Amino acid sequence: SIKIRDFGLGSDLISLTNKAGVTISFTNLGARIVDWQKDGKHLILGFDSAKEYLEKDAYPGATVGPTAGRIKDGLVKISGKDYILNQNEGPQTLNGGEESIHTKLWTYEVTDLGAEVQVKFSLVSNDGTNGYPGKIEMSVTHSFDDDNKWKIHYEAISDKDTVFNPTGHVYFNLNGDASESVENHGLRLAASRFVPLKDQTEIVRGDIVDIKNTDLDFRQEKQLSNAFNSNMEQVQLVKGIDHPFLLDQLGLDKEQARLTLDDTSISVFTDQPSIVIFTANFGDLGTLYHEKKQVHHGGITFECQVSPGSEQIPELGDISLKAGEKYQATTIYSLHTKLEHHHHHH
Amino acid sequence: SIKIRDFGLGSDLISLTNKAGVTISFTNLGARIVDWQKDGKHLILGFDSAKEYLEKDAYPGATVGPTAGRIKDGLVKISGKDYILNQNEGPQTLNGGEESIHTKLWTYEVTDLGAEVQVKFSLVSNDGTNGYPGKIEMSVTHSFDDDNKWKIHYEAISDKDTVFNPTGHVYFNLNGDASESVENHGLRLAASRFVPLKDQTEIVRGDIVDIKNTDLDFRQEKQLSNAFNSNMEQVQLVKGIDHPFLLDQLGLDKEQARLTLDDTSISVFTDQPSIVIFTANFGDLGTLYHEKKQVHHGGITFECQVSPGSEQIPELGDISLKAGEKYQATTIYSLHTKL
Ligand SMILES: OC[C@H]1O[C@@H](O)[C@H](O)[C@@H](O)[C@@H]1O
Numbered sequence: 001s002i003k004i005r006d007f008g009l010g011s012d013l014i015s016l017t018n019k020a021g022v023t024i025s026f027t028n029l030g031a032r033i034v035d036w037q038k039d040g041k042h043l044i045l046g047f048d049s050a051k052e053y054l055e056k057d058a059y060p061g062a063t064v065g066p067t068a069g070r071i072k073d074g075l076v077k078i079s080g081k082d083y084i085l086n087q088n089e090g091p092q093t094l095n096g097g098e099e100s101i102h103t104k105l106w107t108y109e110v111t112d113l114g115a116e117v118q119v120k121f122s123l124v125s126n127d128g129t130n131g132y133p134g135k136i137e138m139s140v141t142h143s144f145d146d147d148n149k150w151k152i153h154y155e156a157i158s159d160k161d162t163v164f165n166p167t168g169h170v171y172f173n174l175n176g177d178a179s180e181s182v183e184n185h186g187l188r189l190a191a192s193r194f195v196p197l198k199d200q201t202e203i204v205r206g207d208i209v210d211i212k213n214t215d216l217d218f219r220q221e222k223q224l225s226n227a228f229n230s231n232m233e234q235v236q237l238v239k240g241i242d243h244p245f246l247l248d249q250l251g252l253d254k255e256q257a258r259l260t261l262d263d264t265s266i267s268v269f270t271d272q273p274s275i276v277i278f279t280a281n282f283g284d285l286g287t288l289y290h291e292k293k294q295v296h297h298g299g300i301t302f303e304c305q306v307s308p309g310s311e312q313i314p315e316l317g318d319i320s321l322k323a324g325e326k327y328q329a330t331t332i333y334s335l336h337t338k339l340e341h342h343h344h345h346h
Numbered sequence: 347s348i349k350i351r352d353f354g355l356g357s358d359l360i361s362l363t364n365k366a367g368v369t370i371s372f373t374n375l376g377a378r379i380v381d382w383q384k385d386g387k388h389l390i391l392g393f394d395s396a397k398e399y400l401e402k403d404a405y406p407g408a409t410v411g412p413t414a415g416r417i418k419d420g421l422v423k424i425s426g427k428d429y430i431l432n433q434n435e436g437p438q439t440l441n442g443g444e445e446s447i448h449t450k451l452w453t454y455e456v457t458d459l460g461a462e463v464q465v466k467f468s469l470v471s472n473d474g475t476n477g478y479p480g481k482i483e484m485s486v487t488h489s490f491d492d493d494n495k496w497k498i499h500y501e502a503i504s505d506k507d508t509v510f511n512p513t514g515h516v517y518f519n520l521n522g523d524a525s526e527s528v529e530n531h532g533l534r535l536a537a538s539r540f541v542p543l544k545d546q547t548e549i550v551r552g553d554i555v556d557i558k559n560t561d562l563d564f565r566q567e568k569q570l571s572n573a574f575n576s577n578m579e580q581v582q583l584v585k586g587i588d589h590p591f592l593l594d595q596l597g598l599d600k601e602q603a604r605l606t607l608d609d610t611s612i613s614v615f616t617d618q619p620s621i622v623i624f625t626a627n628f629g630d631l632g633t634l635y636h637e638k639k640q641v642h643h644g645g646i647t648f649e650c651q652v653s654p655g656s657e658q659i660p661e662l663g664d665i666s667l668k669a670g671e672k673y674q675a676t677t678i679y680s681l682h683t684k685l
Pocket residue numbers: 059069095202242278
């Protein structure tokens with residue numbers, strides 16, 4: 001079933017319930033996921049109104065772009081030309097600059113296919129917005145089906161050669177309480193290499209490093225605490241994880257990642273080449289989620305996209321988008337029960 | 347009473363009914379007025395859903411900006427520097443460029459003061475948006491009161507020196523039907539001068555012309571048919587009226603214009619120096635409003651703002667907005683019924 005109501009400030013909340021009784025909800029404020037519950041338990045982090053997002057933290061569950069991550073000194077080269085984008089994190093352009101797409105009300109239309117329901121959100125980034133050539137007509141379709149798959153499909157077309165590499169900023173927390181660290185979750189990730197950050201400014205270092213057999217190796221499932229407890233320079237630098245992981249095998253067909261807690265798992269599929277993982281390394285900030293003070297490590301993202309730093313490490317890919325060419329990306333989060341045996345204690 | 351409902355595409359329709367039973371409704375799509383009615387009759391033009399505005403005509407009742415009107419060659423000088431804005435009508439930048447603020451979903455908050463209810467719409471125009479320096483934080487507050495006063499108050503702040511001169515694009519039609527020309531309405535307007543257009547491109551001609559004692563003198567109430575049947579080359583040029591009129595006496599207290607049809611009249615007040623009047627000179631277009639095919643002259647606007655063309659005729663004013671300065675503007679449309 002589909003339900004809709006005002007969510008505040010003019011945004012709406014679209015709630016869907018599939019045949020298995022699983023519920024998922026979105027808001028057109030930032031074409032974002034607000035909640036996902038199973039048997040009354042939240043699987044992700046989210047707020048109860050639109051104003052909370054705007055006042056506490058506007059990234060959670062959002063669609064972010066046009067370019068996800070940091071761009072050193074806001075400088076991109078588009079078709080032989082240098083373009084400087086909005087710099088909102090020091091000289092860096094983080095998640096498309098200030099007051100980006102995640103802060104706007106997108107128009108939307110809902111399509112009921114029965115076993116699947118689609119919520120297609122649209123927005124136009126005008127030419128020159130935040131320094132990006134355009135205009136860019138974008139659309140994010142979020143869908144949920146009877147098989148517990150939440151899918152994100154991105155599409156875009158630009159009038160001019162530009163850059164495009166958006167992502168979904170959901171944070172999971174299988175504990176269903178922000179005040180509980182995810183160190184107790186099991187993580188499996190099909191990636192043998194990662195991208196180190198230069199320093200606290202978080203721009204990329206310049207090299208690609210192999211992590212096999214290190215505390216960042218999750219090819220074979222392990223508790224997140226292993227990473228959190230690590231004293232590897234990169235973990236210390238960021239106080240947890242906040243890096244891109246390069247997938248070893250590409251393709252929407254492979255389970256790239258799996259996050260488990262007891263009897264629940266979330267599997268990650270995508271057609272993108274990397275997964276940027278950030279573990280809510282907020283220290284004692286304690287942002288309130290549903291009246292619970294969030295803890296350091298109280299959440300984890302799986303932002304599938306082309307890795308950040310390709311400006312410096314060409315090997316990571318190319319995010320340019322040619323005028324008239326159609327951008328498309330697909331990411332999927334599927335929910336499962338009793339997929340494996342995960343019985344631990346922390 | 348206040349009622350909020352879905353207007354389509356995720357937009358909302360906010361309807362306010364005052365003590366007199368008069369209803370006015372707005373939508374966050376473009377911080378715009380959708381309807382205004384009394385005793386079941388519409389006073390203004392509007393559609394029945396969001397999609398209509400997007401498909402038929404996105405301007406009606408909307409907040410247009412950041413600059414209202416046409417800018418020659420899309421060119422403006424900011425701090426002695428030339429900037430080229432988005433060109434969406436030939437080489438001109440019309441009403442802020444393509445996909446401007448009138449096609450965006452603004453956030454809003456309703457504030458009920460009893461005798462008055464206010465609806466504050468907000469939107470951030472990112473720096474660089476359509477060539478404009480920013481970011482510009484804008485807000486448009488539409489309010490309605492028990493005295494039948496509909497008021498528009500604009501406010502903006504920019505991080506960088508930029509340009510700013512928005513307007514409300516409501517079209518009135520006291521006939522309450524688009525298929526009926528407003529030629530029967532009577533218009534009074536406190537302006538002795540106007541700004542002629544160069545030609546069919548509608549850019550300014552370059553001069554300011556005295557209208558005293560011409561078909562365009564409305565200093566004394568007159569029927570619109572008069573202007574409409576005029577042979578003045580300017581009327582003939584656009585097939586009606588599509589020009590900036592310079593107000594004689596500036597200030598919010600003075601009734602600047604008055605539109606009348608029978609016992610129903612609309613008074614316009616503003617703190618702006620000019621009023622741009624366009625008489626829906628669409629010819630055979632036939633856009634449909636409420637299932638009624640619009641006729642040529644089936645509407646009229648009162649766009650209060652600084653006259654377009656100041657890039658060429660500096661006497662007109664100056665639309666710049668320096669970093670950190672707070673822009674404010676107020677326009678009021680007041681409804682009266684003779685007894
Ligand atoms: O919370 C916003 C951001 O926090 C930063 O510290 C992370 O590096 C970003 O990747 C994330 O988008």
